[PDB]
Design a protein around this ligand. Structure first.
Ligand SMILES: Cc1ccc(NC(=O)c2ccnc(N3CCOCC3)c2)cc1NC(=O)c1ccc(NCC[C@@H]2CCCN2C)nc1
Length: 348
Protein backbone atom coordinates (compact mmCIF):
# COMPACT_ATOMS: atom_id res chain seq x y z
CA UNK A 1 0.00 0.00 0.00
CA UNK A 2 1.50 3.41 -0.85
CA UNK A 3 1.54 6.23 1.71
CA UNK A 4 -1.06 8.89 1.03
CA UNK A 5 -1.03 12.54 1.82
CA UNK A 6 -3.85 15.02 2.16
CA UNK A 7 -4.38 18.47 0.78
CA UNK A 8 -7.38 20.76 0.10
CA UNK A 9 -7.79 21.83 -3.50
CA UNK A 10 -10.53 24.45 -4.07
CA UNK A 11 -13.43 22.65 -2.47
CA UNK A 12 -12.32 19.18 -1.37
CA UNK A 13 -9.64 17.15 0.36
CA UNK A 14 -7.47 15.22 -2.12
CA UNK A 15 -5.83 12.21 -0.56
CA UNK A 16 -3.30 10.68 -3.08
CA UNK A 17 -0.22 8.47 -3.05
CA UNK A 18 3.09 10.34 -2.47
CA UNK A 19 4.29 9.52 -6.01
CA UNK A 20 1.87 12.22 -7.21
CA UNK A 21 3.31 15.72 -6.65
CA UNK A 22 2.50 19.34 -7.52
CA UNK A 23 -1.20 18.88 -7.86
CA UNK A 24 -2.78 21.84 -9.51
CA UNK A 25 -6.60 22.16 -10.34
CA UNK A 26 -7.43 22.10 -14.06
CA UNK A 27 -11.25 21.37 -14.21
CA UNK A 28 -14.30 20.71 -12.04
CA UNK A 29 -17.96 19.58 -12.45
CA UNK A 30 -20.68 17.61 -10.64
CA UNK A 31 -19.20 14.21 -11.71
CA UNK A 32 -15.50 14.94 -10.82
CA UNK A 33 -12.65 17.36 -10.73
CA UNK A 34 -9.17 17.13 -12.19
CA UNK A 35 -5.73 18.22 -11.11
CA UNK A 36 -2.55 18.16 -13.18
CA UNK A 37 0.34 16.46 -11.29
CA UNK A 38 3.81 15.06 -11.76
CA UNK A 39 4.05 11.31 -11.26
CA UNK A 40 7.49 10.81 -9.74
CA UNK A 41 7.30 7.07 -10.33
CA UNK A 42 7.04 7.30 -14.11
CA UNK A 43 8.35 10.75 -14.91
CA UNK A 44 4.97 11.56 -16.53
CA UNK A 45 2.84 14.68 -16.33
CA UNK A 46 -0.52 13.15 -15.34
CA UNK A 47 -4.14 14.19 -14.90
CA UNK A 48 -5.81 12.96 -11.68
CA UNK A 49 -9.58 12.84 -11.64
CA UNK A 50 -11.26 12.60 -8.25
CA UNK A 51 -14.81 11.48 -8.79
CA UNK A 52 -17.34 13.58 -6.92
CA UNK A 53 -19.21 11.35 -4.34
CA UNK A 54 -19.07 8.45 -6.76
CA UNK A 55 -21.56 6.22 -4.80
CA UNK A 56 -24.18 8.88 -3.98
CA UNK A 57 -26.93 7.21 -6.11
CA UNK A 58 -27.35 4.08 -8.36
CA UNK A 59 -26.80 6.29 -11.40
CA UNK A 60 -23.55 7.76 -10.08
CA UNK A 61 -22.27 4.33 -8.85
CA UNK A 62 -22.98 2.66 -12.19
CA UNK A 63 -21.40 5.57 -14.13
CA UNK A 64 -18.26 5.29 -11.88
CA UNK A 65 -18.10 1.54 -12.56
CA UNK A 66 -18.65 2.14 -16.31
CA UNK A 67 -15.93 4.73 -16.69
CA UNK A 68 -13.48 2.57 -14.65
CA UNK A 69 -14.28 -0.50 -16.82
CA UNK A 70 -13.88 1.47 -20.00
CA UNK A 71 -10.60 3.02 -19.04
CA UNK A 72 -9.20 -0.31 -17.74
CA UNK A 73 -9.93 -1.91 -21.13
CA UNK A 74 -8.74 0.77 -23.60
CA UNK A 75 -5.17 0.04 -24.69
CA UNK A 76 -4.45 1.75 -27.97
CA UNK A 77 -2.07 4.60 -29.07
CA UNK A 78 -4.97 6.83 -30.21
CA UNK A 79 -7.23 6.31 -27.21
CA UNK A 80 -6.77 7.53 -23.71
CA UNK A 81 -5.73 4.69 -21.29
CA UNK A 82 -5.58 4.34 -17.57
CA UNK A 83 -2.19 4.96 -15.93
CA UNK A 84 -3.46 4.29 -12.36
CA UNK A 85 -6.56 4.08 -10.26
CA UNK A 86 -6.49 4.43 -6.48
CA UNK A 87 -8.48 4.95 -3.32
CA UNK A 88 -7.23 5.90 0.19
CA UNK A 89 -9.67 3.26 1.63
CA UNK A 90 -8.07 0.24 3.20
CA UNK A 91 -11.19 -1.90 2.92
CA UNK A 92 -14.51 -2.12 1.10
CA UNK A 93 -16.23 -0.87 4.29
CA UNK A 94 -14.38 2.47 4.21
CA UNK A 95 -14.34 2.80 0.38
CA UNK A 96 -15.84 6.06 -0.78
CA UNK A 97 -13.56 7.81 -3.13
CA UNK A 98 -12.07 6.83 -6.49
CA UNK A 99 -9.27 8.61 -8.33
CA UNK A 100 -8.40 7.86 -11.94
CA UNK A 101 -5.08 8.84 -13.50
CA UNK A 102 -4.26 9.39 -17.17
CA UNK A 103 -1.60 11.16 -19.16
CA UNK A 104 -1.94 14.92 -18.93
CA UNK A 105 -3.18 16.15 -22.32
CA UNK A 106 -2.05 19.51 -23.84
CA UNK A 107 -3.82 21.10 -26.76
CA UNK A 108 -7.12 19.86 -28.10
CA UNK A 109 -8.21 19.94 -31.69
CA UNK A 110 -10.06 23.28 -31.19
CA UNK A 111 -6.74 24.76 -30.12
CA UNK A 112 -5.27 23.31 -33.37
CA UNK A 113 -8.07 24.37 -35.84
CA UNK A 114 -8.76 27.84 -34.34
CA UNK A 115 -5.16 29.06 -35.08
CA UNK A 116 -2.93 27.00 -37.42
CA UNK A 117 -2.25 26.52 -41.11
CA UNK A 118 -3.79 23.03 -41.66
CA UNK A 119 -2.41 21.48 -44.79
CA UNK A 120 -4.19 18.57 -46.47
CA UNK A 121 -1.37 16.39 -45.12
CA UNK A 122 -2.20 17.45 -41.52
CA UNK A 123 -5.85 16.76 -42.11
CA UNK A 124 -5.08 13.22 -43.48
CA UNK A 125 -2.87 12.48 -40.45
CA UNK A 126 -5.26 13.82 -37.79
CA UNK A 127 -8.34 12.15 -39.28
CA UNK A 128 -6.35 8.91 -39.87
CA UNK A 129 -5.56 8.73 -36.20
CA UNK A 130 -9.17 9.41 -35.05
CA UNK A 131 -10.36 6.60 -37.42
CA UNK A 132 -7.54 4.28 -36.17
CA UNK A 133 -8.71 4.92 -32.52
CA UNK A 134 -12.38 4.40 -33.59
CA UNK A 135 -11.70 1.14 -35.44
CA UNK A 136 -10.29 -0.01 -32.07
CA UNK A 137 -13.07 1.19 -29.81
CA UNK A 138 -15.82 0.18 -32.21
CA UNK A 139 -14.28 -3.37 -32.50
CA UNK A 140 -15.19 -3.64 -28.76
CA UNK A 141 -18.73 -2.25 -29.40
CA UNK A 142 -17.68 0.83 -27.39
CA UNK A 143 -19.40 3.91 -28.88
CA UNK A 144 -18.10 7.32 -27.97
CA UNK A 145 -21.32 9.32 -28.86
CA UNK A 146 -19.77 12.72 -28.03
CA UNK A 147 -16.90 12.94 -30.43
CA UNK A 148 -16.09 16.69 -31.00
CA UNK A 149 -12.80 18.66 -31.35
CA UNK A 150 -12.61 19.37 -27.58
CA UNK A 151 -12.47 15.60 -26.92
CA UNK A 152 -9.46 15.07 -29.17
CA UNK A 153 -6.03 15.88 -27.73
CA UNK A 154 -3.13 16.55 -30.07
CA UNK A 155 0.61 16.95 -29.23
CA UNK A 156 3.24 19.16 -30.94
CA UNK A 157 3.94 16.18 -33.28
CA UNK A 158 0.18 16.18 -34.31
CA UNK A 159 -0.25 12.79 -32.48
CA UNK A 160 -3.87 12.44 -31.32
CA UNK A 161 -5.81 10.57 -28.58
CA UNK A 162 -9.54 10.25 -28.25
CA UNK A 163 -10.86 11.09 -24.78
CA UNK A 164 -13.89 12.26 -22.97
CA UNK A 165 -13.10 15.38 -20.75
CA UNK A 166 -16.71 15.67 -19.66
CA UNK A 167 -17.05 16.29 -15.93
CA UNK A 168 -20.70 17.31 -15.79
CA UNK A 169 -23.97 15.30 -15.60
CA UNK A 170 -25.56 14.30 -18.97
CA UNK A 171 -28.38 16.80 -19.71
CA UNK A 172 -30.99 18.56 -21.99
CA UNK A 173 -29.90 22.11 -21.04
CA UNK A 174 -26.36 21.00 -22.35
CA UNK A 175 -27.38 20.43 -26.04
CA UNK A 176 -29.55 23.59 -26.18
CA UNK A 177 -29.03 26.49 -28.55
CA UNK A 178 -25.85 27.69 -30.39
CA UNK A 179 -23.54 25.16 -28.81
CA UNK A 180 -20.61 22.97 -29.86
CA UNK A 181 -22.00 20.17 -27.65
CA UNK A 182 -24.55 19.53 -30.43
CA UNK A 183 -22.82 20.57 -33.68
CA UNK A 184 -21.01 17.29 -34.13
CA UNK A 185 -23.86 14.95 -33.16
CA UNK A 186 -25.41 12.53 -35.69
CA UNK A 187 -28.97 13.66 -36.48
CA UNK A 188 -30.49 10.29 -35.24
CA UNK A 189 -28.91 10.93 -31.81
CA UNK A 190 -29.75 14.63 -31.93
CA UNK A 191 -33.44 14.01 -32.47
CA UNK A 192 -33.66 10.44 -30.98
CA UNK A 193 -34.87 9.00 -34.29
CA UNK A 194 -33.91 5.40 -33.50
CA UNK A 195 -31.60 2.99 -31.70
CA UNK A 196 -28.24 4.37 -32.81
CA UNK A 197 -25.18 2.38 -33.89
CA UNK A 198 -21.38 2.96 -33.75
CA UNK A 199 -21.49 5.04 -37.03
CA UNK A 200 -22.96 7.91 -34.94
CA UNK A 201 -19.26 8.53 -34.27
CA UNK A 202 -18.41 8.46 -38.09
CA UNK A 203 -20.93 11.30 -38.59
CA UNK A 204 -19.00 13.27 -35.97
CA UNK A 205 -15.77 12.46 -37.75
CA UNK A 206 -17.24 13.91 -41.03
CA UNK A 207 -18.15 17.11 -39.12
CA UNK A 208 -14.64 17.36 -37.58
CA UNK A 209 -12.86 16.58 -40.86
CA UNK A 210 -15.01 19.30 -42.71
CA UNK A 211 -14.02 21.79 -40.02
CA UNK A 212 -10.29 21.03 -40.28
CA UNK A 213 -10.55 21.51 -44.09
CA UNK A 214 -12.52 24.85 -44.05
CA UNK A 215 -11.72 26.15 -40.54
CA UNK A 216 -15.45 26.60 -39.96
CA UNK A 217 -18.10 24.57 -38.12
CA UNK A 218 -19.92 22.49 -40.67
CA UNK A 219 -23.39 22.63 -39.03
CA UNK A 220 -23.34 25.53 -36.47
CA UNK A 221 -27.10 25.34 -35.73
CA UNK A 222 -28.75 27.80 -33.38
CA UNK A 223 -30.95 25.03 -32.03
CA UNK A 224 -31.82 21.39 -32.92
CA UNK A 225 -34.19 22.35 -35.75
CA UNK A 226 -31.98 24.99 -37.27
CA UNK A 227 -29.15 22.44 -37.19
CA UNK A 228 -31.35 19.75 -38.79
CA UNK A 229 -32.09 22.24 -41.64
CA UNK A 230 -28.40 22.96 -42.17
CA UNK A 231 -27.82 19.19 -42.33
CA UNK A 232 -30.60 18.39 -44.78
CA UNK A 233 -29.55 21.31 -46.91
CA UNK A 234 -26.15 19.63 -47.41
CA UNK A 235 -27.01 15.89 -47.50
CA UNK A 236 -30.58 16.18 -48.83
CA UNK A 237 -33.89 15.23 -47.19
CA UNK A 238 -34.45 11.54 -46.25
CA UNK A 239 -35.89 9.19 -48.81
CA UNK A 240 -38.52 6.50 -48.19
CA UNK A 241 -36.04 3.82 -46.97
CA UNK A 242 -34.65 6.00 -44.23
CA UNK A 243 -38.10 7.31 -43.22
CA UNK A 244 -39.17 3.71 -42.34
CA UNK A 245 -36.21 3.31 -40.01
CA UNK A 246 -37.36 6.31 -38.00
CA UNK A 247 -39.15 4.41 -35.22
CA UNK A 248 -40.39 7.64 -33.68
CA UNK A 249 -43.68 8.44 -35.44
CA UNK A 250 -43.81 12.07 -34.42
CA UNK A 251 -40.17 12.49 -35.62
CA UNK A 252 -40.95 10.64 -38.86
CA UNK A 253 -44.00 12.78 -39.31
CA UNK A 254 -42.00 16.01 -38.66
CA UNK A 255 -39.39 15.22 -41.40
CA UNK A 256 -42.19 14.66 -43.97
CA UNK A 257 -43.36 18.22 -43.44
CA UNK A 258 -40.09 19.53 -44.85
CA UNK A 259 -39.72 20.60 -48.49
CA UNK A 260 -37.68 17.97 -50.29
CA UNK A 261 -34.07 18.95 -51.05
CA UNK A 262 -31.45 17.14 -53.10
CA UNK A 263 -27.99 16.25 -51.73
CA UNK A 264 -25.66 19.20 -52.62
CA UNK A 265 -22.47 18.99 -54.62
CA UNK A 266 -19.69 18.61 -51.92
CA UNK A 267 -16.94 19.87 -54.30
CA UNK A 268 -18.82 23.14 -54.43
CA UNK A 269 -19.11 23.30 -50.60
CA UNK A 270 -15.49 22.17 -49.93
CA UNK A 271 -13.89 24.37 -52.60
CA UNK A 272 -10.31 23.58 -53.33
CA UNK A 273 -10.21 20.45 -51.12
CA UNK A 274 -8.51 17.23 -52.16
CA UNK A 275 -11.09 15.34 -54.28
CA UNK A 276 -10.37 12.22 -52.18
CA UNK A 277 -11.23 14.21 -49.02
CA UNK A 278 -14.42 15.22 -50.69
CA UNK A 279 -15.17 11.61 -51.62
CA UNK A 280 -14.54 10.45 -48.04
CA UNK A 281 -16.78 13.18 -46.66
CA UNK A 282 -19.60 12.08 -48.94
CA UNK A 283 -19.30 8.52 -47.50
CA UNK A 284 -19.21 9.76 -43.88
CA UNK A 285 -21.92 12.32 -43.98
CA UNK A 286 -24.76 10.05 -45.12
CA UNK A 287 -28.04 10.54 -43.27
CA UNK A 288 -28.92 6.85 -43.12
CA UNK A 289 -26.53 5.46 -40.60
CA UNK A 290 -26.82 1.93 -42.11
CA UNK A 291 -25.06 3.36 -45.23
CA UNK A 292 -22.24 5.35 -43.60
CA UNK A 293 -18.66 4.15 -44.15
CA UNK A 294 -17.25 2.38 -40.99
CA UNK A 295 -13.93 3.28 -39.37
CA UNK A 296 -12.37 0.08 -40.75
CA UNK A 297 -13.59 0.79 -44.27
CA UNK A 298 -12.46 4.45 -44.02
CA UNK A 299 -8.83 3.52 -43.03
CA UNK A 300 -8.72 1.68 -46.44
CA UNK A 301 -9.91 4.77 -48.39
CA UNK A 302 -7.38 6.27 -50.80
CA UNK A 303 -7.34 9.56 -48.87
CA UNK A 304 -5.20 7.74 -46.26
CA UNK A 305 -2.78 6.00 -48.65
CA UNK A 306 0.30 7.63 -47.10
CA UNK A 307 -0.66 6.43 -43.57
CA UNK A 308 -2.76 3.25 -43.86
CA UNK A 309 -1.11 0.09 -42.71
CA UNK A 310 -3.48 -2.78 -42.18
CA UNK A 311 -0.88 -4.59 -39.99
CA UNK A 312 -0.68 -1.65 -37.58
CA UNK A 313 -4.42 -0.85 -37.05
CA UNK A 314 -5.32 -3.11 -34.12
CA UNK A 315 -8.68 -4.21 -32.76
CA UNK A 316 -9.55 -4.48 -29.11
CA UNK A 317 -9.88 -7.50 -26.84
CA UNK A 318 -13.49 -8.58 -26.30
CA UNK A 319 -15.21 -6.18 -23.92
CA UNK A 320 -17.98 -7.53 -21.74
CA UNK A 321 -20.61 -4.89 -21.14
CA UNK A 322 -23.35 -7.15 -19.93
CA UNK A 323 -23.27 -5.16 -16.68
CA UNK A 324 -25.18 -2.46 -18.59
CA UNK A 325 -28.35 -4.48 -18.20
CA UNK A 326 -27.65 -5.66 -14.61
CA UNK A 327 -30.09 -4.45 -11.97
CA UNK A 328 -27.82 -3.78 -8.93
CA UNK A 329 -28.00 -1.88 -5.63
CA UNK A 330 -25.59 0.92 -4.82
CA UNK A 331 -23.41 -1.24 -2.61
CA UNK A 332 -23.15 -3.97 -5.31
CA UNK A 333 -22.02 -1.40 -7.89
CA UNK A 334 -19.68 -0.12 -5.22
CA UNK A 335 -18.20 -3.60 -4.52
CA UNK A 336 -17.74 -4.36 -8.25
CA UNK A 337 -15.96 -1.00 -8.58
CA UNK A 338 -13.77 -1.79 -5.54
CA UNK A 339 -12.67 -5.09 -7.05
CA UNK A 340 -11.73 -3.31 -10.27
CA UNK A 341 -9.70 -0.73 -8.35
CA UNK A 342 -7.79 -3.34 -6.36
CA UNK A 343 -7.20 -5.64 -9.40
CA UNK A 344 -5.69 -2.85 -11.59
CA UNK A 345 -2.26 -3.54 -13.07
CA UNK A 346 -0.37 -0.58 -14.47
CA UNK A 347 0.68 -0.39 -18.12
CA UNK A 348 4.36 -1.17 -19.11
C1 LIG B 1 -7.71 11.91 -15.51
C2 LIG B 1 -8.79 11.36 -16.42
C3 LIG B 1 -9.65 10.33 -15.92
C4 LIG B 1 -10.66 9.78 -16.77
C5 LIG B 1 -10.85 10.32 -18.07
N1 LIG B 1 -11.89 9.76 -18.86
C6 LIG B 1 -11.97 9.74 -20.19
O1 LIG B 1 -11.18 10.32 -20.95
C7 LIG B 1 -13.12 8.92 -20.78
C8 LIG B 1 -14.35 8.69 -20.08
C9 LIG B 1 -15.36 7.96 -20.72
N2 LIG B 1 -15.08 7.46 -21.96
C10 LIG B 1 -13.91 7.63 -22.61
N3 LIG B 1 -13.77 7.06 -23.89
C11 LIG B 1 -15.02 6.77 -24.59
C12 LIG B 1 -14.78 5.88 -25.83
O2 LIG B 1 -13.75 6.49 -26.66
C13 LIG B 1 -12.52 6.68 -25.92
C14 LIG B 1 -12.72 7.65 -24.74
C15 LIG B 1 -12.86 8.42 -22.05
C16 LIG B 1 -10.03 11.36 -18.56
C17 LIG B 1 -8.99 11.90 -17.72
N4 LIG B 1 -8.13 12.90 -18.18
C18 LIG B 1 -8.58 14.16 -18.11
O3 LIG B 1 -9.73 14.43 -17.78
C19 LIG B 1 -7.67 15.27 -18.50
C20 LIG B 1 -8.00 16.57 -18.10
C21 LIG B 1 -7.13 17.63 -18.45
C22 LIG B 1 -5.99 17.31 -19.18
N5 LIG B 1 -5.08 18.29 -19.56
C23 LIG B 1 -5.31 19.70 -19.19
C24 LIG B 1 -5.39 20.66 -20.40
C25 LIG B 1 -6.55 20.57 -21.39
C26 LIG B 1 -6.59 19.21 -22.12
C27 LIG B 1 -7.07 19.47 -23.56
C28 LIG B 1 -7.15 21.00 -23.67
N6 LIG B 1 -6.37 21.54 -22.52
C29 LIG B 1 -6.63 22.99 -22.22
N7 LIG B 1 -5.69 16.01 -19.50
C30 LIG B 1 -6.50 14.95 -19.17
Amino acid sequence: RPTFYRQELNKTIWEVPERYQNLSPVGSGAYGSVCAAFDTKTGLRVAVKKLSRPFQSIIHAKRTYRELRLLKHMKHENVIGLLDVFTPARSLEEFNDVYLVTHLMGADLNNIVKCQKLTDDHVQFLIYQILRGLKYIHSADIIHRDLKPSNLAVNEDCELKILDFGLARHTDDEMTGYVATRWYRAPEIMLNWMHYNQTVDIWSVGCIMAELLTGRTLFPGTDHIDQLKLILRLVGTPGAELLKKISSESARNYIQSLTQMPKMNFANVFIGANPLAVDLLEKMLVLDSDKRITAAQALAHAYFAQYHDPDDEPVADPYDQSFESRDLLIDEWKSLTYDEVISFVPPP
